Coordinates of C-alpha atoms and ligand atoms in Angstrom, one line a residue:
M5 CA -31.3 -8.8 10.5
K6 CA -30.1 -12.3 8.8
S7 CA -26.7 -10.7 7.3
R8 CA -25.5 -11.1 3.6
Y9 CA -22.5 -10.9 6.3
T10 CA -24.1 -13.9 7.2
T11 CA -25.5 -15.2 5.3
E12 CA -22.9 -16.4 2.6
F13 CA -19.6 -16.5 4.8
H14 CA -17.9 -18.1 7.4
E15 CA -16.3 -16.1 9.2
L16 CA -13.2 -17.5 10.4
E17 CA -10.8 -14.8 12.1
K18 CA -10.1 -11.3 12.9
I19 CA -6.8 -10.3 10.8
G20 CA -6.8 -6.5 10.9
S21 CA -8.1 -4.0 12.6
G22 CA -8.1 -0.1 12.4
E23 CA -9.9 3.1 13.3
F24 CA -12.0 2.2 10.3
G25 CA -13.2 -0.9 11.9
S26 CA -12.5 -4.5 11.0
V27 CA -11.3 -7.2 8.3
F28 CA -12.0 -10.9 8.4
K29 CA -10.8 -13.9 7.4
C30 CA -13.6 -15.4 5.1
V31 CA -14.7 -19.2 3.8
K32 CA -17.8 -17.7 0.9
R33 CA -20.2 -20.6 1.5
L34 CA -21.5 -21.3 -1.9
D35 CA -17.7 -20.9 -3.7
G36 CA -15.5 -22.6 -0.6
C37 CA -12.7 -19.3 -1.6
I38 CA -11.3 -17.4 1.7
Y39 CA -11.4 -13.9 1.5
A40 CA -10.4 -11.3 3.2
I41 CA -13.4 -9.0 4.2
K42 CA -13.5 -6.1 5.5
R43 CA -16.1 -4.2 7.9
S44 CA -16.4 -0.9 8.9
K45 CA -19.4 1.3 10.5
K46 CA -21.5 2.7 7.6
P47 CA -21.2 7.1 7.3
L48 CA -23.4 9.3 6.9
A49 CA -25.1 9.5 4.0
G50 CA -24.3 12.7 1.3
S51 CA -20.9 13.1 3.5
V52 CA -18.0 13.4 2.9
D53 CA -16.8 10.8 5.0
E54 CA -18.8 8.9 2.5
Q55 CA -17.5 10.0 -0.8
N56 CA -14.1 8.6 0.7
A57 CA -15.6 5.4 2.1
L58 CA -17.5 5.4 -2.0
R59 CA -14.0 6.3 -3.5
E60 CA -12.5 3.5 -1.9
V61 CA -14.8 1.1 -3.8
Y62 CA -15.0 3.0 -7.2
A63 CA -11.0 2.4 -6.6
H64 CA -11.5 -1.6 -6.3
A65 CA -13.9 -1.3 -9.4
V66 CA -12.1 -0.2 -11.8
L67 CA -8.1 -1.5 -10.3
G68 CA -9.5 -5.4 -11.3
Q69 CA -7.1 -6.6 -13.1
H70 CA -4.1 -6.5 -11.9
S71 CA -1.8 -9.0 -10.6
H72 CA -0.3 -6.2 -8.6
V73 CA -3.0 -5.0 -7.4
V74 CA -5.4 -7.0 -4.5
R75 CA -8.1 -7.9 -6.4
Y76 CA -11.8 -7.1 -5.4
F77 CA -15.1 -9.2 -5.5
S78 CA -18.0 -7.2 -4.0
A79 CA -19.5 -4.5 -1.8
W80 CA -22.7 -3.6 0.0
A81 CA -24.1 -2.4 3.2
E82 CA -26.3 -3.2 6.4
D83 CA -26.9 -2.5 8.5
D84 CA -25.3 0.1 9.9
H85 CA -22.1 -0.5 7.8
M86 CA -20.4 -0.9 4.7
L87 CA -18.6 -4.7 3.6
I88 CA -16.0 -4.6 0.8
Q89 CA -15.1 -8.4 0.1
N90 CA -11.2 -9.0 -1.2
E91 CA -8.7 -12.0 -3.1
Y92 CA -7.4 -13.0 0.8
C93 CA -3.7 -13.1 0.9
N94 CA -2.0 -16.2 2.8
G95 CA 1.0 -14.5 3.3
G96 CA -0.3 -11.8 5.6
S97 CA 1.8 -8.0 4.9
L98 CA 4.7 -7.2 4.4
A99 CA 4.7 -5.0 7.9
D100 CA 5.0 -8.2 9.9
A101 CA 7.4 -10.4 7.7
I102 CA 9.5 -7.0 8.1
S103 CA 9.0 -6.7 12.1
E104 CA 9.9 -11.2 11.7
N105 CA 13.9 -10.6 10.1
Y106 CA 13.9 -7.3 12.3
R107 CA 14.2 -9.9 15.0
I108 CA 16.0 -12.6 13.4
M109 CA 18.2 -10.4 11.9
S110 CA 18.0 -11.7 8.4
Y111 CA 16.4 -9.3 5.7
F112 CA 14.7 -8.8 2.9
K113 CA 19.3 -9.5 0.4
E114 CA 19.2 -7.1 -2.3
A115 CA 17.9 -9.4 -5.4
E116 CA 14.4 -9.7 -2.7
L117 CA 14.8 -5.6 -2.8
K118 CA 14.8 -5.7 -6.3
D119 CA 11.7 -7.8 -6.9
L120 CA 9.7 -6.0 -4.0
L121 CA 10.3 -2.9 -6.4
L122 CA 9.8 -4.1 -9.2
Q123 CA 6.7 -5.4 -8.5
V124 CA 5.2 -3.5 -6.6
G125 CA 6.7 -0.6 -9.1
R126 CA 4.2 -3.2 -11.6
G127 CA 1.0 -2.0 -10.0
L128 CA 2.2 1.2 -9.4
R129 CA 2.4 1.6 -13.7
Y130 CA -1.0 0.4 -13.4
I131 CA -2.2 1.9 -10.9
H132 CA -1.1 5.6 -12.2
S133 CA -2.1 4.5 -16.4
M134 CA -5.7 4.8 -14.3
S135 CA -5.3 8.4 -13.4
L136 CA -5.6 7.4 -9.5
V137 CA -2.6 7.3 -6.9
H138 CA -3.0 4.8 -4.2
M139 CA -1.5 7.5 -1.3
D140 CA -0.4 5.7 1.6
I141 CA 1.9 3.0 0.2
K142 CA 3.5 1.4 2.9
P143 CA 4.2 -2.0 3.7
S144 CA 1.1 -2.5 6.2
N145 CA -0.3 -2.1 2.8
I146 CA 1.3 -4.1 0.6
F147 CA 0.2 -7.7 0.8
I148 CA 2.2 -10.9 0.2
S149 CA 0.7 -14.6 -1.6
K170 CA 7.2 -18.0 -5.7
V171 CA 6.6 -14.3 -3.6
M172 CA 4.4 -12.6 -5.3
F173 CA 3.7 -9.3 -3.0
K174 CA 0.3 -6.7 -3.9
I175 CA -0.5 -3.5 -3.3
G176 CA -3.6 -3.0 -0.7
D177 CA -6.1 -0.6 0.7
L178 CA -6.7 2.0 -1.5
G179 CA -8.7 3.8 1.3
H180 CA -6.7 7.1 -0.1
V181 CA -6.5 6.1 -3.6
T182 CA -7.7 9.6 -5.8
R183 CA -7.8 10.9 -9.0
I184 CA -4.1 12.3 -10.2
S185 CA -5.4 15.9 -10.6
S186 CA -7.9 15.6 -6.9
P187 CA -7.1 19.5 -6.1
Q188 CA -8.0 18.0 -2.6
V189 CA -5.7 14.7 -0.5
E190 CA -5.6 13.1 2.8
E191 CA -2.6 12.8 3.6
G192 CA -1.3 8.9 3.5
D193 CA 0.8 7.4 6.7
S194 CA 3.7 10.1 8.2
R195 CA 6.9 7.9 8.0
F196 CA 6.1 7.5 3.8
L197 CA 5.6 10.9 3.1
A198 CA 6.8 13.4 1.0
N199 CA 7.0 17.3 1.4
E200 CA 5.1 17.9 -1.5
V201 CA 2.6 16.6 -0.2
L202 CA 2.3 17.5 3.7
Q203 CA 2.7 21.4 2.0
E204 CA 0.0 20.6 -0.2
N205 CA 1.2 20.9 -3.8
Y206 CA -0.6 17.9 -5.1
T207 CA 0.7 19.1 -9.2
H208 CA 3.2 15.8 -8.7
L209 CA 1.0 13.5 -6.9
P210 CA 2.5 9.9 -8.4
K211 CA 5.8 11.0 -7.1
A212 CA 4.6 10.8 -3.5
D213 CA 4.1 6.7 -4.4
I214 CA 7.4 6.5 -5.2
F215 CA 8.9 8.2 -2.7
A216 CA 6.8 6.2 -0.3
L217 CA 7.2 3.0 -2.0
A218 CA 11.5 3.6 -1.6
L219 CA 10.5 4.3 2.1
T220 CA 9.3 1.2 2.2
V221 CA 11.8 -0.7 0.1
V222 CA 14.1 0.7 2.7
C223 CA 11.9 -1.4 5.8
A224 CA 12.4 -4.5 4.1
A225 CA 16.4 -4.1 3.4
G226 CA 16.3 -3.6 7.8
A227 CA 16.0 0.2 8.6
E228 CA 15.6 1.0 12.2
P229 CA 11.7 2.1 12.4
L230 CA 10.9 5.6 10.3
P231 CA 10.3 9.2 12.2
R232 CA 7.5 10.2 12.3
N233 CA 8.6 14.0 12.8
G234 CA 11.3 15.3 14.6
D235 CA 15.0 15.9 12.8
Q236 CA 15.4 12.4 11.1
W237 CA 11.8 12.8 8.9
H238 CA 12.9 16.1 8.2
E239 CA 16.3 15.1 6.7
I240 CA 15.1 11.4 4.8
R241 CA 13.1 14.6 2.9
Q242 CA 16.1 16.4 1.9
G243 CA 17.0 12.8 -0.5
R244 CA 19.3 10.6 3.0
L245 CA 19.0 7.7 2.3
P246 CA 18.1 6.2 6.4
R247 CA 20.6 3.6 7.3
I248 CA 20.8 0.0 5.9
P249 CA 22.1 -2.8 7.7
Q250 CA 23.2 -4.9 5.0
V251 CA 25.9 -4.0 1.9
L252 CA 23.4 -3.3 -1.2
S253 CA 25.2 -2.3 -4.9
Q254 CA 25.9 1.1 -6.2
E255 CA 23.6 1.4 -8.3
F256 CA 21.0 0.5 -5.8
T257 CA 21.3 2.7 -3.7
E258 CA 21.6 5.0 -6.0
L259 CA 18.1 4.6 -7.4
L260 CA 17.4 4.7 -4.5
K261 CA 18.3 7.5 -4.2
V262 CA 16.9 8.7 -6.9
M263 CA 13.5 8.1 -5.4
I264 CA 13.1 10.4 -2.6
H265 CA 14.7 13.7 -3.8
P266 CA 13.3 16.3 -3.1
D267 CA 12.1 17.5 -7.0
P268 CA 9.9 15.4 -7.3
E269 CA 10.2 15.6 -11.0
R270 CA 13.7 13.8 -9.9
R271 CA 12.3 11.1 -8.8
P272 CA 11.5 8.5 -11.6
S273 CA 8.1 7.6 -12.8
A274 CA 6.7 4.2 -12.2
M275 CA 6.8 3.4 -15.7
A276 CA 10.2 4.8 -16.3
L277 CA 11.4 3.0 -12.9
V278 CA 9.3 -0.9 -14.2
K279 CA 11.8 -0.7 -17.4
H280 CA 15.6 0.7 -14.9
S281 CA 18.6 -1.3 -16.0
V282 CA 18.2 -2.0 -12.5
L283 CA 15.9 -3.5 -12.2
Ligands
824_301 O1 -7.8 -7.0 0.7 C1 -7.5 -7.2 1.8 N1 -6.7 -9.1 1.3 C2 -6.0 -9.2 2.1 O2 -6.2 -10.3 2.1 C3 -5.9 -8.3 3.5 C4 -6.7 -7.1 2.8 C5 -6.9 -6.5 4.1 C6 -7.3 -4.9 3.8 C7 -9.1 -5.0 2.9 C8 -9.7 -4.2 3.0 C9 -9.4 -2.9 3.2 C10 -7.8 -2.4 3.6 C11 -6.9 -3.4 3.6 C12 -6.2 -6.3 6.0 C13 -5.2 -7.7 5.2 N2 -4.8 -7.9 6.3 C14 -4.6 -9.1 6.8 C15 -3.7 -9.7 7.5 C16 -2.8 -11.2 6.7 C17 -3.1 -12.3 6.2 O3 -3.0 -12.4 5.1 C18 -4.3 -10.7 4.8 C19 -4.5 -9.8 4.9 C20 -5.4 -8.4 4.8
MG302 MG1 -3.5 0.0 5.7
MG303 MG1 -10.9 6.6 -0.1

């Protein structure tokens, strides 16, 4: 053996795990810097799963110049593994910040929600300008590094006009995508970003299915435990409109008067 991973990096700790492998905080020996490295089992060459694994790499290889998307450094294969070395964000995930806030009953305030929405919105405007869509926006895929929010986990990225898509987290999924209608994919990322902001505003954990799931898809915002300006609430509402054409594009969101 004597892995590139082992020889080039000192592994500090495990920071994420899934049915997609694990992510480790590592120090690169030569440059002294800390990176996040995802190490996953290598798919059978030529398989659909390998195509999917490589999309992640290809998406990272083209989305590496934006301040609101986690930067990519390198990727390689060794052993029975594929590895991707990305920028490390020392503030943890948005999900973890929201979970801590939940317990302490002190949520993101309106100014902070607007900042989150604008920052990730800029990240989305960049991804969408590249004719790509993220397809899995949610708090556990947004990382924190003035606070800076960055979109990570490009494992569901695909081209905007793709006839096949892999569905992102059910809790943030727009109905049209579930219905296999891929005519306005970028608006699916907008819908998930609004629900992401709702979670940051202190809402109860989102439904995975059932009656409350359908209600949100009818364009009804979940209850938020704080008073928000009507103008801001209306923007979140239009972002989950049942008609994807009514939702703002990422460009329109970033230029929105409310922000
Ligand atoms: O790319 C990343 N940059 C990161 O800083 C990072 C990343 C990932 C990640 C890496 C590849 C695929 C999907 C997620 C998971 C992650 N979980 C984390 C938990 C804590 C943290 O401070 C950072 C990360 C983290
Ligand atoms: Mg993830
Ligand atoms: Mg993929």
